[PDB]
Design a protein around this ligand. Sequence first.
Ligand SMILES: Nc1ncnc2c1ncn2[C@@H]1O[C@H](COP(=O)(O)OP(=O)(O)O)[C@@H](O)[C@H]1O
Ligand SMILES: Nc1ncnc2c1ncn2[C@@H]1O[C@H](COP(=O)(O)OP(=O)(O)O)[C@@H](O)[C@H]1O
Ligand SMILES: [Mg+2]
Lengths: 345, 347
Amino acid sequence: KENICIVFGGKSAEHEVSILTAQNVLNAIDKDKYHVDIIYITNDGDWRKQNNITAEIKSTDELHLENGEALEISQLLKESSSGQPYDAVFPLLHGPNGEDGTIQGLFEVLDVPYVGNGVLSAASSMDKLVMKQLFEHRGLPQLPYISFLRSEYEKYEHNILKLVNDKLNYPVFVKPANLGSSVGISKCNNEAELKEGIKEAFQFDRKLVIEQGVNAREIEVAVLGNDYPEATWPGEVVKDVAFVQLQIPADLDEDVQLTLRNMALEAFKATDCSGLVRADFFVTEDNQIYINETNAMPGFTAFSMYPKLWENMGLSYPELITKLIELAKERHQDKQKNKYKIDRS
Amino acid sequence: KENICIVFGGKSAEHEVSILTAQNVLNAIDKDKYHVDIIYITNDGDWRKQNNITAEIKSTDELHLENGEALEISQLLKESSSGQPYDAVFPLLHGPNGEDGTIQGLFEVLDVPYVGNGVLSAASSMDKLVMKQLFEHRGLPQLPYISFLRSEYEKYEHNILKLVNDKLNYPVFVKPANLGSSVGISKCNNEAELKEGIKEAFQFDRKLVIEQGVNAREIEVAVLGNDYPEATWPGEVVKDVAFVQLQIPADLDEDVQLTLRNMALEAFKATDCSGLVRADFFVTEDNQIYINETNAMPGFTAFSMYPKLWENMGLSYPELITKLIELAKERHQDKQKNKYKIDRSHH
Ligand SMILES: Nc1ncnc2c1ncn2[C@@H]1O[C@H](COP(=O)(O)OP(=O)(O)O)[C@@H](O)[C@H]1O
Ligand SMILES: Nc1ncnc2c1ncn2[C@@H]1O[C@H](COP(=O)(O)OP(=O)(O)O)[C@@H](O)[C@H]1O
Ligand SMILES: [Mg+2]
């Protein structure tokens, strides 16, 4: 029997999705094969541990949450309540406080084997600009964009707006580079607008992307692997306007589907991901494809896109979960073979 | 008065150099400005805290702590000897177990303010391939190079070897992407030597970079700041054979030295550094410039290049230290000041 720990919660108000996912994930683990502990991270940033989940979880009362063992962050986060080192820890708490990448650093320092993206790829995909430079270098098509720091806008305001207006068709989107799923995003149909959208954006962040806008369907691909990743067929959110229901496989040409699969595999490598990523694309009417973002820790509930896409290929939710754990162990072991092989030269 | 923590050691090859640097920093720090605590981390993850340093440490063996404050990592970083949170934690230690950016991660999670680069920047400057992609997008000159993963190498050996000849000129250097200033590196004068190098490196790493060897000088620039960084004049690492000794300022003509100062500033932004970076360049006898690498946590001894290049601009070692601490404060306060603003607006 193996030992697992699910870390969840977080400082965010994406807190409650984090609890739901924890629930789904716990109930899809075969307790006859896995010893599971969980750690909950409060809004205020405290860590609470509950030991040895063995029953099914029918609701949130059954989670102790804030009233677990007040846990000091320590060597012990490596130790399971069976008495044994954790074979894998599963962080289900999106892009924490500071940034994604941070908690993965905590685990690396503590030498705890964890599921998913490591530091570079989790950090790089929380940063919209770096992410875009890596996809460009990998050759992936993307909408036209411009970026700059606050300090650069403070002394080249005329130049920057000329650049926008010259290489970019309104409407454009202003996006803070370092926040996910959030604030400072504004549609700008003209320079007056643009100018205040940037002003708006810079109350929250030091770094912006300005992006040319399109009408597209949003299409998504799940990938799973370490060195030999595999990609799903794509799926989409079922709608008639780009201005919850899901279509898997997405309604698209056979070839557009292959292309998107391959792009997703290339996007995975561009960021040097481990475990998983979800690659999200914009696909226009005449099938022009643009990569929008990769997502290092995507929605992972029972009905989340990322799980449903693997269901399309006969990998059920529990098997997905087991597979992510084996990929976590594989990865931790190759690191230790290298950390050792290194030290002996 | 302000509360500071020096955290030094590691599990690393450079463990003693980390101790040496701790002594350097502890002695230049004005104990009439800062209360100072120290966290020793041995090559066993045996974190040890010692409070309130107010003495001018003579040997580097004083820094081999026999014991820590009993508490766990979390208690040791969230409170200073004085009881309030730290103004600034100064990591003088690489960050072992999957290398740099990790200990920063730790500090972010405990919400502790710290000196030097962030997660993304410390991680990027350790991945030579990602670093190189950011320098390229930014417009900086680089030596011809080819990168690939182990799996690409097992699928397509031939075609890559072909490319190496089609693009590079021997001798080439084979470099692992993710190991630090470490082995697995090699010059390779021919395809048989390249073949072995691929092999040697793949034992330590799953991703490599092959780069055109050059003949050039080793020329380094020191950068300091957050959003409004400044760069020093260059210095040269002086050696009759590349396979210690500094000339500050470097014997280079003026526009060249002007070009490198600005190139350092661009390198700092390509990787989105904070606090400091040391930009390393290759300059040919023909005054041809290529950036080799940036270094997020350069040597920081009293004799090291980075500190010395600041000395040349009139910023002494104690001031330099005081300045990295203030930068670490501004950057923490800035983050937190954005956090509250984000929380505030409810559309
Ligand atoms: N260039 C664009 N064209 C059309 N819609 C966009 C564009 N950029 C962003 N959006 C819309 O805003 C949403 C958020 O942008 P995205 O880049 O996905 O950032 P995040 O999802 O990290 O907040 C997207 O789902 C998309 O519909
Ligand atoms: N392409 C090259 N041509 C000539 N010399 C090189 C080349 N690449 C590396 N070297 C030498 O090897 C040394 C170490 O490698 P470097 O690229 O600086 O990374 P690191 O210090 O992380 O090992 C350098 O000090 C440099 O002088
Ligand atoms: Mg070097």
